[PDB]
Amino acid sequence: ETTALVCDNGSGLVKAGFAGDDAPRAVFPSIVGRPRHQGVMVGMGQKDSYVGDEAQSKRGILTLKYPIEHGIITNWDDMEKIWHHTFYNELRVAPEEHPTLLTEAPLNPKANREKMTQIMFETFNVPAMYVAIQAVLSLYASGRTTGIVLDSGDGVTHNVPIYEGYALPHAIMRLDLAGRDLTDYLMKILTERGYSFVTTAEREIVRDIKEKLCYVALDFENEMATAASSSSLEKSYELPDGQVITIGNERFRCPETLFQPSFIGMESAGIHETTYNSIMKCDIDIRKDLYANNVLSGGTTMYPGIADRMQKEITALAPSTMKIKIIAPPERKYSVWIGGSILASLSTFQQMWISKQEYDEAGPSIVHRKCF
Amino acid sequence: ETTALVCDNGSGLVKAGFAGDDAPRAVFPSIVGRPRHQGVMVGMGQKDSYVGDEAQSKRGILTLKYPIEHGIITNWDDMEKIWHHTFYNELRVAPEEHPTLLTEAPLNPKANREKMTQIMFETFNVPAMYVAIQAVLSLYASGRTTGIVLDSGDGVTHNVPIYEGYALPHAIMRLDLAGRDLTDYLMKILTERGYSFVTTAEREIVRDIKEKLCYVALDFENEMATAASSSSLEKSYELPDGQVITIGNERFRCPETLFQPSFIGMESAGIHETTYNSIMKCDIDIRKDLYANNVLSGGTTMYPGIADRMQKEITALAPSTMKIKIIAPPERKYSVWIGGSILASLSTFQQMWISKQEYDEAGPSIVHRKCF
């Protein structure tokens, strides 16, 4: 059988690998770089652009930019350099031998679905491809065919109810606020404490801090009080150049913005609220499976203690005769990619791929007939 | 009514005076001096420290040190000597009779707000006080309750979107480049021309030069070309010990760093990009007033020809269906202090002051209940 590349298009880390595996084989930063100089590096082989660990390590002669922001490809030309790095550097294989499965947000722009279809087929010469919604794959990685996924990436949060592998297209909810925003917010609130960070070389350490030290409080007022009454809600972090900084209440405040969007000037409702407002669009005979199968997904859901908080919040909005229970997979950060590996290795799914001939007949638009 | 002291905590000139005036009554250097040697003077007595025009004129046996660097109080002990000078030497009044209004940068560190609050109340015995963001006051001096302020102050730059007297806490932008590092930069680029200045006694003349001779170009490439093609972009300055020096393209290059931060190794975006990136975080119903009330504030904005440059730059970024115009006050260097005198003399504001009784009952953190 043809080995598929499953490539999860993350807004902060790219997760990529071969199908038939139950885990990604490549994980690298979603960063693309270009020279500070008027040309190539002195006395060394020619490259016009740099990616991942090469861009992170050669940084002193580069300007760096991001290819994807808030679940949207914000520059085609840099998403291409992630793809070029993915096939030829990280997996060291010809993509033209390997069908491609691409992850996307719910309601990902159609002009974008097409530019992705076109770029894969014309430049990389892929033999076949498909594009799939993040939450739909995370449900398959949760071992269940019907349920709802709260998927919170490194840049967007969605609530996506699904019946027997199809997402319900009227009931989906979106919130631009998650891991990208969360770093910029964390950085603001640290400046406020008097640990001013103003440089993007600091922003990436603030990102790492966030991933290591943030935790979801079970009760926001009680933890806030605890930090005001005692300094036991603070953890030290030693920066790379020495200098021990102390991270305080910012730990739980940073992710608190997910429950209360008004903290950062947004008019949107919270992630638990948009869970409730999503399920109540669905039929009563299926609401039982949706409320019982609330699945957490994506990088932002890997903060400890999240389940007890989300269990609380949803039972408070939802009637006490829908069964309520949080499903948190063992490695929920990868569940989109794992579900993509499962889907790409089903025997019945091999009829679903976009072929190169159908692309030659209908242009990039074929994704709106073969995909959903 | 009680006469307030409005004290602008400026990074190069302290501006101070009495409220009910529409102009500062003391405008003096933000400098403190300390002896290089024991037995400082013969037949004339001694002092352990010096401030302002006394430190500038008695300089021949002094090290100079500073209260405020980068808009940030960097040494409490020098900020105190500036304050001691302000009340007892310059205005020749008891501060304990006069409520105090202190200016601050947007997002000024909270441990700093509290050390300033504590120092004012315990040592100076002030009857009441308040702390206010610089840019908010400059908007009141522009006759306005809603607008976006570029506060490019005496030593820090901010873009500050202000809505009905409140600076929006998610939409503020900061730049670590203004009238402080502009001197240090000017000095480097003169050394490059072969007018080597290495002494801090030379640096303060370079400062004066900068204030007198710098001008904002309307077009950076066209003025640069003009200086390369002709020596008509050069103005002479006679140094205070004879010797006529010629200041060239450095005039417009020095401030050029505000538009292009990469010239000095900073990763930051320019004052125009940080204007657009600020207003794009603001609500569409208030954009209509914010874009119409683009207000210039601070010492760094007093370079001629700024408005035509700023008008250009922001129309190129922001779309062509907004009321894009630049507001430049008649004496924009003082608009913080003037707005502080206006605020301190409103009949509705007199409930807002931290009283000595509230400081005695609640301690230094009272600033985080009375101020924002």
Next chain:
Amino acid sequence: ETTALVCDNGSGLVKAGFAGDDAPRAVFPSIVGRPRHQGVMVGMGQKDSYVGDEAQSKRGILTLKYPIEHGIITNWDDMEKIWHHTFYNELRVAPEEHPTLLTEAPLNPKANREKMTQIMFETFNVPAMYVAIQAVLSLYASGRTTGIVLDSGDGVTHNVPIYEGYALPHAIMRLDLAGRDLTDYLMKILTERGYSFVTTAEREIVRDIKEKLCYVALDFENEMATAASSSSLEKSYELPDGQVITIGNERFRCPETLFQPSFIGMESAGIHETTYNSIMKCDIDIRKDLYANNVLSGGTTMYPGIADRMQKEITALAPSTMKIKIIAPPERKYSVWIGGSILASLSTFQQMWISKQEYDEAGPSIVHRKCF
């Protein structure tokens, strides 16, 4: 490849020779002389000017002057007499058959780079030339592409952080103190002991003394105490006309001015302070390699025991988790010239030269396009 003449523009020793060699071919004093009176010699042919070992030996008839003072070319007419002596007397070769590489300090004046370029193409008719920063060559000679150099040369001290190629142009820091003023200082402090010197013929012996007998103390107060408590910190020197003089604490005091510029009325920061203030301007992911690889360069760094002192001083300034090391090359007095000798021999470097054709097409301005 064409044999490149590498000229080290040292402020006290000229160093010269052919590229592709491990050590300089000529090492002679940076001195030029002219007659003190009308009529100068009988019985042998008179000369209008004198240079190098001829000026050092025939000294009494000469007004000696120095072509490079304070790291800056101060008299064009004497810098030409060094270069005419270098090609036709010392190496005995035609320079019009050879490319030329010139060493320079950082931030070298544009008018001086232009007058040197013009002299090379129009006084000496060279086919090609290039100009390079002392520290960049010393680092390349060491077998490295990344590090910070403390280049304490003959006439000036510079701090120069370098990464994977060129120096970082915003981060460089300067001090107007090295081997030049060290002699004049040594001479003052000997007069103070009662070994008065007045003749510039005495100053050159004081120079030699300085190079032989000065040593960097590891602890300034403890060595000072030792000399006050015992005469074991004194070494004898027999002058060239008999008379045994005793050199005391002056040995470590002389170079002590590098750490404390206030000893000689300067306002500047010390060599360790300007090292730390330079590295703190660099990007965080390269601060690691810059703090780890602190490199010594120049004649003034050849005083024994310097590494343990500098190791101390920098660890006290910089935090204790970038793991500091002092790199002191085996022949760190010569590493500038050796770096030029290595670099000018490479096939990759032959594209960097300023040609006589580019000087005919663009004039003296070409050096600011070709040099980095």
Next chain:
Amino acid sequence: KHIAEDADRKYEEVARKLVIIESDLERAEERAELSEGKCAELEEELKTVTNNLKSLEAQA
């Protein structure tokens, strides 16, 4: 002269060996500490992983 010269050659031989050892000492320090940083990193990860294992054991 002949004696000085023979001391200079030897001193230059020892010097040449010395800079090889100094470059090799520097690379030996840099690698030692980089491994130590990575070793600390892996220790923070086992330590978290354990705790998640101990939280998971109470759940299980």
Next chain:
Amino acid sequence: KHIAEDADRKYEEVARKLVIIESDLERAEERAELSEGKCAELEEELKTVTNNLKSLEAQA
């Protein structure tokens, strides 16, 4: 003789210094090697615990 003797003093000090540099190389080698073994070790520990946690997680 003076020129020979001073050259000898600096080279002899350089020699005394080389010997320290040599001891220091040895000490870096021992640390570097040891820490890479501790990393290899810690990866095998982290791997066992993680495989073990995975098998439990899967029973969960």
